[PDB]
Amino acid sequence: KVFGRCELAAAMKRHGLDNYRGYSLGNWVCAAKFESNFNTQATNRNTDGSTDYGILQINSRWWCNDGRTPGSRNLCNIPCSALLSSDITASVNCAKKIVSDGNGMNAWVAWRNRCKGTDVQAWIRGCRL
Ligand SMILES: [Cl-]
Ligand code: NA
Ligand code: NA
Ligand code: NA
Ligand code: NA
Ligand code: NA
């Protein structure tokens, strides 16, 4: 599913991401835009052989099991395919574990390079929330 901007904001808010660990909703929508272009089915292969999955491009090296990343962990205890669902629950629940692990949203390279230190509230401007 390809989300609209305000549709995704509303879904993330309902799942408790607004201000989660101090990150306002616009941060999460900005990260989703540049990680996946709001597409839950996005995948991308990394140089080390791991793969990033879903709307927030969660990596199989640490967070989910895809059966083809040897020596990796599965810290969210989910198959990576669950992160491609039109229902973002699994992605959101795993993202909450990632953002609490000490590095905050810096775990998402696109957030650090394209959202951090910008007016992220623009990403939810105009939305009915
Ligand atoms: Cl980047
Ligand atoms: Na879909
Ligand atoms: Na915001
Ligand atoms: Na790829
Ligand atoms: Na894994
Ligand atoms: Na959803």
Author numbering: 1 to 129
From the paper:
A technique which does not introduce any crystalline non-sample material into the beamline is acoustic levitation, where the sample is presented without contact from external supports as has been previously demonstrated for MX at the Swiss Light Source. Protein crystals are suspended in single, microlitre sized droplets, coated in silicone oil and presented acoustically to the X-ray beam. The device both suspends the sample and also imparts a modest but sufficient motion to allow for a complete, high-quality, rotation style dataset to be recorded and processed in an efficient and routine manner. We have presented results demonstrating the potential of acoustically levitated, oil encapsulated drops as a physical mount free method for Macromolecular Crystallography experiments.
The lysozyme crystal structure (structure factors and coordinates have been deposited under Protein Data Bank (PDB) entry 6QQ329) was determined from a single continuous collection run of 5,000 images (yielding 4,086 merged and scaled diffraction patterns) on a drop containing an estimated 4–6 crystals with dimensions ranging from 100 to 800 μm. We have exploited serial crystallography data analysis tools to analyse detector frames on an individual basis, given the absence of a fixed axis of rotation for the levitating droplet. Although all patterns from the best single data collection run were included to optimise the data metrics of the deposited dataset, as few as 500 images were sufficient for a 96.7% complete dataset to 1.69 Å. A more detailed analysis of the 5,000 image structure solution run reveals the presence of multiple lattices and their respective motions during data collection. The largest continuous run from a single lattice is 2,260 frames (maximum separation of 3 between consecutive images). Exploiting the fact that near complete data could be obtained by relatively few images, further investigation of radiation induced changes to the protein structure was undertaken by comparing datasets formed from the first and last 750 images of the 2,260 image run. Isomorphous difference maps showed no significant or obvious features. However, a comparison of the two 750 image subsets did reveal a drop with an I/σI from 6.06 to 4.23 over a resolution range of 39.75–1.70 Å and from 1.14 to 0.69 in the highest resolution shell (1.73–1.70 Å).
